[model samples]
Target: GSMIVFDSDGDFLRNGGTYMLSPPNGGGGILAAAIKDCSLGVIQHESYTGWPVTISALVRPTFISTSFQLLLSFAYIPPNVCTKNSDWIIKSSNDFEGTVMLGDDKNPVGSLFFIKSYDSSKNYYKLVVCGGRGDEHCRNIGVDKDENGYKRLVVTEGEPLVLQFDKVNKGNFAFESNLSMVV
Candidate 1:
């Protein structure tokens, strides 16, 4: 509860920063806009665009231990779906494990996630999905490869996906009003 999350440049992670989650050592793949039927996946960077996500921390200036929610700021979701709520939820769909998807934002317990500092520097971290208010249990966020060679985020007991947050070009770095860009 004492460490602050940092970005690739060793700067404090801000709530308004549009960052991309990518594995630094793997095949150089970022969380692209590779949305499946109702699940999320990873695809070639050159082929698909990376939907940069913003962190919604209950306590501002972001911490690694506190509860957090991820929001897809510029998502390309279904047509005519007026509500642009794109919060990530670790929900189960009658399957053994849960898949990260755009789900209801009201369920904070289901959408709540935390980060574990993988490195002492606190820049590299592993996404941990929280269960409930007092459940005090979590799972390492991993990825699964389907037959189509798509890598979707999954909960795994094995090697968890190590992620590095890189600032997006369209990110809001200043301390501007949140309502300033609502249009």
Candidate 2:
């Protein structure tokens, strides 16, 4: 079966300044396109090119238990273009775990994004994962979490699960895909 994950970067405003990701044209430039007349020279302008970001739609434990593994990947626009340090996070929708990781040249294969696991589920029963600036990782801003700042979730059944990238610093410079376990 197939699943859909809904996510957003919360704000399209770049870390240094503010600008929105351009609307996708039919020509296949749906990732990044600068906002015309909105240039402030990298320092305050959001690039229309590409950004550092990635989406990992994964499903673990090929059985019917709330415990499962995650298959994740990430992409991002280098910090030389912006000052905000990139990070990654995952929150579960079941009674299992949640995770966060810092981007490194190995794990995510780009910026120093975080790479931790979500291993607490005494509350929430559903999961939501996101990758972006480090400040947003493991914060549980718009997601579910306990009083101690721990996230929770309930895992769903099925293969080819869909992981969504809702927002990525706003400039629409995001990515997504269908992921699953191989073991």
Candidate 3:
């Protein structure tokens, strides 16, 4: 079943593993934002750069829940990363509930997501987001084109987005390699 998700290398998906969720084509990918206002929401699209996001499995609710859903978040933060806020948990929009947004340390609900089996033959998984309480309070996340034809993540029962996880190594924990600046 797609319940047991695996990485690009066919390795078991480990808890607290660093990864990036995106289509098989290596597009912009999901990000903490789709800005600075601290209210910047989450979006999936093309970008010039990409970073590793964290995937953590829930251990306490195993007997209660069917899937080993996880909490996706950006564990590391840099001064020039995005905002000054610490909590970079991915959250579902409360206003409309169909969109994915950013959450803080205090608000953690609506942040639990699970990777469902999409196409085992292709080693792809479908990203599912929880809507709220109740058995059917969840749906698969899909990508829709925005005004500029850029991709955006949204919960749609129609055709969910096919996803793949790529493991990343955060070496040195620093981004100061290129000292060259505009001359």
Candidate 4:
């Protein structure tokens, strides 16, 4: 499945700036474009071309007293480019767990949970495994923690994930992990 980001103004996010979703001439899947300014406090789209970031898992699924394993690959794309390559892999242990509540329903249980960092000073992104909404409960990838400690769903890595174009070529793009969960 593909995930799209939008601002409070209800505009679809893209590499250029916030814009509404428009009908395609021939394509079928959803498509939108947006750009932001990270240095400013204003609510605008910022571009991340090649910046260091982190991806962490906040929850795992547990049923019948057992846990399942999840493997994910991530990639990036630049402006005018239509495709991205999955260059990174994320692995989680069966011991990671978190709290998931939905409409007065709660499941405070144990499962795979761990924090993976690509940068030392910043935790740019987080992943959550929610509960109580069918397959929707399994959707849990987002940005930094919110007021309630939940990570805001947003892009944290890749081409458009960077905040400034000038700072794009300044950081190390390579990430290494010693854990068995990473490859």
Candidate number of the best lDDT: 3
- Overall lDDT per candidate, in order of appearance: 0.55, 0.26, 0.57, 0.23
After superposition, candidate 4 runs with Cα above 4 Å error: 1-72, 76-94, 98-126, 134-171, 174-183
Off by over 4 Å in 3: 34-37, 60-66, 77-97, 108-110, 131-134, 146-150, 169-183
Q: Candidate 3 — what's its lDDT?
A: 0.57
RMSD to truth, every model: 7.0, 16.4, 5.3, 18.5
The estimated TM-scores of all candidates read 0.68, 0.23, 0.70, 0.19
By TM-score, the candidates rank as 3, 1, 2, 4
Question: What's the alpha carbon RMSD for model 1?
Answer: 7.0
Pairs of residues at least 3 apart in sequence or in different chains that clash in candidate 1: none
TM-score of 2: 0.23
- The residue-by-residue lDDT of candidate 1 on 1-183, one tens digit each, is 546678788877777566766566574434433343233333323223345566666555544333454333333233223233555666564442766655533443336667667776646788777556633667887777645555666776667788787776443322233212211
**lDDT per residue (tens digit) for residues 1-183 in model 2:** 122222233322122222221222211111211112121011111123333334222332222122222332324433332223233333232333432333333333322221122222211123333346432432221222333332211222211111222344543444232111000
Query: Which of 1 and 4 is ahead in TM-score?
Result: 1
Local accuracy of candidate 3 as per-residue lDDT tens digits, 1-183: 325667888877777678766577555655544233254345565542344567676674322122776676655434433344423344444333365555543465436777788787988887776645632567777766545444556776767778777776444223443111101
Name the lDDT value of residue 154 in candidate 2: 20
Clashes of 2: 45
